[PDB]
Amino acid sequence: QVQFKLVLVGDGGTGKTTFVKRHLTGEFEKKYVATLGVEVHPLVFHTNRGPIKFNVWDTAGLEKFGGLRDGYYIQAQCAIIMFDVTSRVTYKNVPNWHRDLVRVCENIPIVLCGNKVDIKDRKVKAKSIVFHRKKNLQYYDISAKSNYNFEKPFLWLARKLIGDPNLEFVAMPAAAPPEVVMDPALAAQYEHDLEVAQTTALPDEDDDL
Amino acid sequence: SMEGILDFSNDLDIALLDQVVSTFYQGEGVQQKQAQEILTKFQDNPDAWEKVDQILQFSTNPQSKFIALSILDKLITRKWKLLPNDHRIGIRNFVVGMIISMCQDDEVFKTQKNLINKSDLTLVQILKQEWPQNWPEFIPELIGSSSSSVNVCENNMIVLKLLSEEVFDFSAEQMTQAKALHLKNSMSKEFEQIFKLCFQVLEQGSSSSLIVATLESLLRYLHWIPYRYIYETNILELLSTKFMTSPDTRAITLKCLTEVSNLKIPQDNDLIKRQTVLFFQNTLQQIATSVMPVTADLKATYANANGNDQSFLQDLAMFLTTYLARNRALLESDESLRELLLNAHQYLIQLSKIEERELFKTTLDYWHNLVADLFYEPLKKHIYEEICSQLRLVIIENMVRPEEIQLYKSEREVLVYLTHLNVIDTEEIMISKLARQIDGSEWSWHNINTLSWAIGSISGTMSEDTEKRFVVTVIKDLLGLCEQKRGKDNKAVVARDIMYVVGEYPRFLKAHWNFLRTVILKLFEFMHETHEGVQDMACDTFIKIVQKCKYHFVIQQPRESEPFIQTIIRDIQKTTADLQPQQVHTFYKACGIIISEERSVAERNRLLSDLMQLPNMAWDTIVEQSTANPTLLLDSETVKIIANIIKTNVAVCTSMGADFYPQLGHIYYNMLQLYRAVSSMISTQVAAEGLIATKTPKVRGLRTIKKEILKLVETYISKARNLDDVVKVLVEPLLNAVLEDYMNNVPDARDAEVLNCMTTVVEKVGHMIPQGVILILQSVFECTLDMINKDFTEYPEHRVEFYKLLKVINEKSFAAFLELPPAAFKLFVDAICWAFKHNNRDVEVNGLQIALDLVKNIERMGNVPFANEFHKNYFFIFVSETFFVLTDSDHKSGFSKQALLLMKLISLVYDNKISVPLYQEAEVPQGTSNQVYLSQYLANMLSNAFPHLTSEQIASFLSALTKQCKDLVVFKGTLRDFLVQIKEVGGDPTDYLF
Amino acid sequence: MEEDEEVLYKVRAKLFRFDADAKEWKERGTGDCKFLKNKKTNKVRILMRRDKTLKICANHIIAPEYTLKPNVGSDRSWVYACTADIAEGEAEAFTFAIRFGSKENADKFKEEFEKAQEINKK
Numbered sequence A: 001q002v003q004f005k006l007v008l009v010g011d012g013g014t015g016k017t018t019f020v021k022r023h024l025t026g027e028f029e030k031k032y033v034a035t036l037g038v039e040v041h042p043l044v045f046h047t048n049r050g051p052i053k054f055n056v057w058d059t060a061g062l063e064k065f066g067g068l069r070d071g072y073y074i075q076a077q078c079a080i081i082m083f084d085v086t087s088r089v090t091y092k093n094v095p096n097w098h099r100d101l102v103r104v105c106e107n108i109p110i111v112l113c114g115n116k117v118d119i120k121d122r123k124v125k126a127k128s129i130v131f132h133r134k135k136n137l138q139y140y141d142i143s144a145k146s147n148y149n150f151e152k153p154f155l156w157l158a159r160k161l162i163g164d165p166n167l168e169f170v171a172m173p174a175a176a177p178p179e180v181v182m183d184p185a186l187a188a189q190y191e192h193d194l195e196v197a198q199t200t201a202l203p204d205e206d207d208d209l
Numbered sequence B: 001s002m003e004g005i006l007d008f009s010n011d012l013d014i015a016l017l018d019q020v021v022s023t024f025y026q027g028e029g030v031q032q033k034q035a036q037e038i039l040t041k042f043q044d045n046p047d048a049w050e051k052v053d054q055i056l057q058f059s060t061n062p063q064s065k066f067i068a069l070s071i072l073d074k075l076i077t078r079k080w081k082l083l084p085n086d087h088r089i090g091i092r093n094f095v096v097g098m099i100i101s102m103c104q105d106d107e108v109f110k111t112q113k114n115l116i117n118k119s120d121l122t123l124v125q126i127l128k129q130e131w132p133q134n135w136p137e138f139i140p141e142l143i144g145s146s147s148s149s150v151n152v153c154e155n156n157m158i159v160l161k162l163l164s165e166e167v168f169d170f171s172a173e174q175m176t177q178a179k180a181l182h183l184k185n186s187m188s189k190e191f192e193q194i195f196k197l198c199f200q201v202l203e204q205g206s207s208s209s210l211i212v213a214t215l216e217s218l219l220r221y222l223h224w225i226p227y228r229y230i231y232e233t234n235i236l237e238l239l240s241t242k243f244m245t246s247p248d249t250r251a252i253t254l255k256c257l258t259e260v261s262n263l264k265i266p267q268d269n270d271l272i273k274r275q276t277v278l279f280f281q282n283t284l285q286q287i288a289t290s291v292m293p294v295t296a297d298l299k300a301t302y303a304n305a306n307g308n309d310q311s312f313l314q315d316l317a318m319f320l321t322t323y324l325a326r327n328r329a330l331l332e333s334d335e336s337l338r339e340l341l342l343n344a345h346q347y348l349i350q351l352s353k354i355e356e357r358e359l360f361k362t363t364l365d366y367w368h369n370l371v372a373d374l375f376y377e378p379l380k381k382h383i384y385e386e387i388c389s390q391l392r393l394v395i396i397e398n399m400v401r402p403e404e405i406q407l408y409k410s411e412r413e414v415l416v417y418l419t420h421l422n423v424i425d426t427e428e429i430m431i432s433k434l435a436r437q438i439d440g441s442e443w444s445w446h447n448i449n450t451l452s453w454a455i456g457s458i459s460g461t462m463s464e465d466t467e468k469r470f471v472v473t474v475i476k477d478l479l480g481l482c483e484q485k486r487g488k489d490n491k492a493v494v495a496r497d498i499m500y501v502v503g504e505y506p507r508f509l510k511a512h513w514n515f516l517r518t519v520i521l522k523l524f525e526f527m528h529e530t531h532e533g534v535q536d537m538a539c540d541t542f543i544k545i546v547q548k549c550k551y552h553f554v555i556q557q558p559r560e561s562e563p564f565i566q567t568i569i570r571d572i573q574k575t576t577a578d579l580q581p582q583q584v585h586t587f588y589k590a591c592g593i594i595i596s597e598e599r600s601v602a603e604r605n606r607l608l609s610d611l612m613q614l615p616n617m618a619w620d621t622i623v624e625q626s627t628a629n630p631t632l633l634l635d636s637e638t639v640k641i642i643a644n645i646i647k648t649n650v651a652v653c654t655s656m657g658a659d660f661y662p663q664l665g666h667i668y669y670n671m672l673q674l675y676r677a678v679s680s681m682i683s684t685q686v687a688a689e690g691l692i693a694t695k696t697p698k699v700r701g702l703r704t705i706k707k708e709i710l711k712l713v714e715t716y717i718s719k720a721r722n723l724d725d726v727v728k729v730l731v732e733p734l735l736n737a738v739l740e741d742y743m744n745n746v747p748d749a750r751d752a753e754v755l756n757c758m759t760t761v762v763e764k765v766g767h768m769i770p771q772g773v774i775l776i777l778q779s780v781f782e783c784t785l786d787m788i789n790k791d792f793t794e795y796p797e798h799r800v801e802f803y804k805l806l807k808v809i810n811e812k813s814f815a816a817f818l819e820l821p822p823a824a825f826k827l828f829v830d831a832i833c834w835a836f837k838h839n840n841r842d843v844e845v846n847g848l849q850i851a852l853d854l855v856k857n858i859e860r861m862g863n864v865p866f867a868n869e870f871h872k873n874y875f876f877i878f879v880s881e882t883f884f885v886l887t888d889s890d891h892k893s894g895f896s897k898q899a900l901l902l903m904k905l906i907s908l909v910y911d912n913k914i915s916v917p918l919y920q921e922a923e924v925p926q927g928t929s930n931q932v933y934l935s936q937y938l939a940n941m942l943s944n945a946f947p948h949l950t951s952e953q954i955a956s957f958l959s960a961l962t963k964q965c966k967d968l969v970v971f972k973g974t975l976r977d978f979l980v981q982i983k984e985v986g987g988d989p990t991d992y993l994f
Numbered sequence C: 001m002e003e004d005e006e007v008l009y010k011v012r013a014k015l016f017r018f019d020a021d022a023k024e025w026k027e028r029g030t031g032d033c034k035f036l037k038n039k040k041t042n043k044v045r046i047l048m049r050r051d052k053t054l055k056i057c058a059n060h061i062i063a064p065e066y067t068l069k070p071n072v073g074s075d076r077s078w079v080y081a082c083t084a085d086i087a088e089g090e091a092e093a094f095t096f097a098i099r100f101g102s103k104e105n106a107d108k109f110k111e112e113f114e115k116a117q118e119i120n121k122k
C-alpha cells in the first residue's frame, strides 16, 4: 500500500468536506459546518495494482477560518480545486486557489472539480469553464449529492501518481461475515434503540432511492 | 506540553516548535490534530511576528521557517506601515540575506525549494509595500547580484516572475487602482534593464534550471510587455528553434509562443507578418524533427502517458489552435506556405483523436472557428478538403447524446457546417459506418447510439430530396439491423435508435402522412413493451414528433375519416393502459399540444372535453364518494388516483395554457372543496400523531394533492389571456381556499407552493385586485417572516418564495405596503435588510431589488408626509445596512446591486431630492443641508466601524463616493479601493483621486 | 471473495445506519443489495456494494432472529437491528434502514429475506 498527500482547496460552501465525508462513510451531510483550518482523513481505494491510500487535507475555504493557508500545501503530491457551478464567484476565485497551490507544489497532478451539477439552475456554464486548459488540470463536472463522476477525481489522480493509465478501481474483497446469538441482557436495550429508529423519518423520501 | 509555544510570557523553545510542526506534518490522528490547533493559535497571535527572526535563525525544521514566513506575510500585508523605517529596512535586509545565503549553499538550493520560493514571495510582498519609492535600487542590485552566482541568478528570475504576477496578473482585486497603476508604471520604467538580463541568460545559455526559470518569467512578461521586445530582438528565433529542441525548455517555450501569438501587433507591416510566419515554421519544423512526425499516432502516445507527454500534447493543441485562429490567413495566400498550413491542421486532426474530453473540446472550439469561416469566406474551403474529410469521421465517431447540451451543440454545429461543405462525403461516411454496424465488425450499443446521434444531428442540412433518399436508406438499414439482432436487449437498443432518428426528421414526416401515421401507430405498439427504456423512448418520441408535426394531426388528411387527434383520443385508454403515471402525463401533454392547433373554439373545447373524459369520470366518481363519505380519502390508493388526476390536468394545462380554461372551469369548485377537505385531514393527523405526521406516506400523499392543485392554478393563471375571468371567477374562491389554511397551520404544515401560486396571481392580475393583495399580505407576511428570521437555514423554500412574493407585490401593488400599520411597515424594512444579509443568491438579490424598487416607489410619491416620514425613519437604516454587507466580506456576490443601492441613496441627498431634514432637531445647526449631515453621519459610522482608518482616508473616500454617485463603474471602483484599504493600515488617501 | 456464492436475489437500494448520538439516519451506501448463498455452508448473507467505488456498505448473515419493521416515513423501507456487520472490518452492531425504488421492491425484498432466514436455520 502506497500513500499520497492530497490537498483539497476552494471557496467556502463549494462541497469539499461533503465530498470527502461521502467518500469516507457514504453519508451525505446537508448542513454547512465551515472547516476550521484543515481536517485530515485517510481514504483507501482498492485497485487492480493493489490498495492506494490518500491522506486527504480538506482545507478551509473561508478567509476567517483559513488557519495555516498555504502551510497546508507543503509536500502535497496531488490536489483537487473545487468550485460550485451554482455560484459564479467560486469559479472566479479558482485562479487564486491555483496560484497559491502551485507556488508551493510546482509539479503535481491537479483535478478541477465543478460541484453541484445536480442543481437545475446552473450558473457556471460549460462554455465558461476553460481555466484548466492552459494550466494542464484535469476537469470533471461532479455532484457529491447525486454521486455524478464521484470517483473520477481520485481514479485520475491514482492513474497519475502510480504511472499506470490502465489502473482500475476494483471490488474490495468481501470476507465471510461472522454468525452470532443475540446477548439476552441487551434484548431490552435493542427494542428501545429500534423504537427511536422506526419513529425517526428517513431523509429525502422523494428521491429515486 | 506541546501547548508551551503558546505561552508568550516565556521565550520560544524553538525545539518545541519543531516537534509541534513535525507532529502536524508527519504525525497521525489525535496527535496531528492537537499540533494543528496549537500551530494555528501560534500563527494568529498578533505578536507572533516578533518571533520570526529567532525561528529563521535557530530552527532546523524548514516547515517551521515556512510558517514563520506566513506570520511575517500577515504583518507585511496588513500592519507594515505601523513599523519605524529602521525596523522595515531590518526585516527587508534579513529576508534578502536569508535568500542569498540559501542560494549560495548548493545543498540547500537543491533540497529546500519550498522554503526559498516562500522567501521569494515574502520578498515580493515587501516590494509591494516598499518599492520603488523607499527602495529605488532594488532592480539594479538584483541585476548586479545575478552575475555573481548561477543559483542567485535563477532565484532572481523566480522573484521577477512573482513580482510580474503580483503587479499585472493578481493586482486587480488585491490593490487600489492607484497602487496597481504605480507598480505597473514602476515595472514598465525598469523593464529595459530586466529584459537585457533575461535575453543575455537566454543567449549565453548552459544551465537548464536557469534557462527554465528565465523562460517561466518571460511567460509572465508576455502578458503585458510591448511586442518590440519579441519582434525586434533575436528572441523569437531562440524560442522557435533552440528552446523547442531540448525537452526541459520545450513545455515553457510552447506556452511562451502561445502568448507571443496573442501580443498586440501592427496589422499593416510585411516584415512582422513574415516574422509571425517564420516562428510558426521554425516551431513546427522542431516538432516534426525532434518530437514526432505529422503521421504519429498521438491517441496511442497520450494513452501511454509516458513522462510529460500528456501536458506537452495539451500545450501543442493550445499553441496550434491559438496561432491558427489568429494567423491562418497569413498561410493561405502563398503556395510556399501551403504544406506548413496543412501539416499544422494535420497535427490538430491527430490531437483531435486523443481520448481526453477536455482536450477534444479545445480542438473542437478551433474546428468550429475554421468550418464557420469556410462556410462564409470565399475561395477558402478547397484548401481544407482533405482536413475536412478526416474531421467528418472524427466528429461522427465522437458524437455524444444531446443530453450533454454544450458538447452536443458544438459537435452538431461543426458537423452541420461540414455537411454543407460536402454532403456526399458526410452521407458516404454515415452509410459506411452503418454498413459496419450491420456486418458486425464495429457493432456495439455505444457505436450504434453514437452513429444515430450523428445522423440525427445533421437533419435540415440536406435538400429535401437528398434527405428523403438518405433517411429512407438509414431507416431500412436500422430495421435490417434490428431483425438480424438476437434477444430483447439488442432489439430494444436499435428500436430506440430508430425512434431517435425518426424524431429528428420532421420535414420528412410532414411530407409523407402515410409514414407519419405508421410511426405514431408503431410508437403506440411500443407503449406496451415493458422492456426498460422502450416506453420512455416511445413517449418522449411521441411528444417530440407532436411538437414539430402537430398541424398534421389537427387537419383531416386525404383518405382519412377524421383528424388523427380524434383517432388518438378514441383509443387513449387502450394506448396508455400499460404506461406508468409520468408516461400517461407526457401522452396527455402531447395531446394538449395538438388540440391547441385547433383555432375553431367549439371544436377545440370538444377535443379538450374528449381528451379529459377518463380523468373527469374518475374525478366525478371520487367526488360523488369523497363528499358522501369523507373516510374514503384516508385510503392510500384513492389519494394516488386523485394526485394523478390533478397531475394529468397540470400536464394538459402546460401545453394548452389559455385554451385550458373550460376544463379548469369543469373541476374548479370541487377541486377547491377537495383542497379544504385534504387540509382538514392534514391538520387532524398532525394533532393526532405530532409533527412526525408530516413525514408519513399518507400526509405526504395529501400534501401532494394540495401542491398539484396550487401548481394547476399557477400554470393556468400564468398563461391566461382573459384576466377578467381570472379576477371574477378564479381569484376569490382561491384566496378563500388557500390563505387562512396557510396562516392557521403550524410552520411545518405550511406549503411554500402557496407563496409561489400567490406570486403568479399578483404578477398577472395584482393591478386589478388591490384588496386581494392586502389579504395575501395579511395572511402570509408576519407568519412567514417568523419562520425565516431565527437563522439563514430553516424553511429554505419558504425563504425564497417569500422574497419573490414581496418583490412582485412591491412592483405591482405598492399601495398594499402603504395600507400596512406603522409596526408592520417596520417589519417589512427589517425583512428587506434580513434578505441583504443572506448568502443564498436567490434571497440576497431579491432583497436588494426590493430595496431599489421601494426607494423608487417612495421617490414616485413626490413631496408628501409618507415619503418624508419614510426617509426620516429608514434612509440611514438602508445606507448603514448596505454598507455593512458591502464591507463585511461575507456578501461579495451582492456587490453590484449593493453598489447600485448605495449610489441611489447617496444621489437622493446629492440632488437635494429629500424635502425634510434627515437629522432630528438641535443635533446640528438647523440651517444645515442633508448633504453636509450625510457626510458627517458616514464619516462617524466608518470611523467607529474601521477605527484603524485615518480621518483623511474616510473624508477622501466619501468625497470620491459623492462625486461619482452618477457613474456606477467608477463608484464601484471607489468601493473596491475602500475594501482593499480597510484590510491594511496606512492606505494612501490620494488613491481616491484615481 | 464472492466466487463460491450463488446470487439468490439482486435489488437496487439505499442503506442507512442510525446515529443514536445525533438521533438521525446517515446514508451508508447506494447500489446493488445482494443475497449470497455460500455453496460450502449454504449460509445466506447480505452483501451490498456502493455505485462507482464498489466499496462494501453491508456484509452480514441474514440472522433468523432479525425482524424487518416499517419506518414511520416510508412505504418502501425496512429497519432492522444487526449485531455483526463487517463492511468496515471489525464486527459491529447497527440499526439499519434499507430503502428501495417501490413498495413492490421492498415487499419482494422481505419475501426473499424470510426465504433466506429459513435457509439459514438448516
Ligand SMILES: Cc1ccc(Cl)cc1N1CCN(c2ccc(C(=O)O)cc2NC(=O)c2ccc(Br)cc2)CC1
Residues within 6 Å of the ligand: B471, B472, B475, B476, B479, B495, B498, B499, B501, B502, B503, B505, B506, B508, B509, B515, B516, B518, B519, B522, B523
Ligand atoms: C419499426 C419502427 C420502429 C419505430 C419507429 Cl418510430 C418506426 C418504425 N418504422 C415502422 C415501419 N416503417 C416502414 C415500413 C415499410 C416501408 C416500405 O418500404 O413500404 C417504409 C417504412 N418507413 C420508412 O421508410 C420511414 C419512416 C419514417 C422516416 Br423519418 C423515414 C423512413 C419503417 C420503420
Ligand SMILES: Nc1nc2c(ncn2[C@@H]2O[C@H](COP(=O)(O)OP(=O)(O)OP(=O)(O)O)[C@@H](O)[C@H]2O)c(=O)[nH]1
Residues within 6 Å of the ligand: A010, A011, A012, A013, A014, A015, A016, A017, A018, A019, A028, A029, A030, A031, A032, A033, A034, A035, A036, A059, A060, A061, A062, A115, A116, A117, A118, A119, A142, A143, A144, A145, A146
Ligand atoms: N445540491 C448539492 N449540495 C451540495 C453538494 N455538495 C455539497 N452540497 C451542500 O453544500 C454545502 C457544502 O458544505 P461543505 O462541504 O461543508 O463546504 P466546504 O467546501 O467544505 O466549505 P469550507 O469548509 O467552509 O471551505 C452543504 O450544505 C452541502 O450539503 C452537491 O453536489 N449538491
Ligand SMILES: [Cl-]
Residues within 6 Å of the ligand: A024, A042, A043, A044
Ligand atoms: Cl477509508
Ligand SMILES: [Cl-]
Residues within 6 Å of the ligand: A126, A127, A129, A130, A139, B361
Ligand atoms: Cl468544460
Ligand SMILES: [Cl-]
Residues within 6 Å of the ligand: A132, A133, A136, A137, A138, B314, B358, B359
Ligand atoms: Cl486539458
Ligand SMILES: [Cl-]
Residues within 6 Å of the ligand: B184, B185, B188
Ligand atoms: Cl504599464
Ligand SMILES: [Cl-]
Residues within 6 Å of the ligand: B324, B325, B326, B327, B328, B329, B330
Ligand atoms: Cl485568420
Ligand SMILES: [Cl-]
Residues within 6 Å of the ligand: B510, B549, B551, B552
Ligand atoms: Cl407543418
Ligand SMILES: [Cl-]
Residues within 6 Å of the ligand: B615, B644, B645, B648
Ligand atoms: Cl389519471
Ligand SMILES: [Cl-]
Residues within 6 Å of the ligand: B777, B778, B781, B782, B820, B824
Ligand atoms: Cl400585516
Ligand SMILES: [Cl-]
Residues within 6 Å of the ligand: B789, B830, B831, B834
Ligand atoms: Cl429580521
Ligand SMILES: [Cl-]
Residues within 6 Å of the ligand: B883, B884, B887, B945
Ligand atoms: Cl459598516
Ligand SMILES: [Cl-]
Residues within 6 Å of the ligand: B078, B948, B982, B983, B984, B985
Ligand atoms: Cl486591519
Ligand SMILES: [Mg+2]
Residues within 6 Å of the ligand: A016, A017, A018, A033, A034, A035, A058, A059, A060
Ligand atoms: Mg469544509
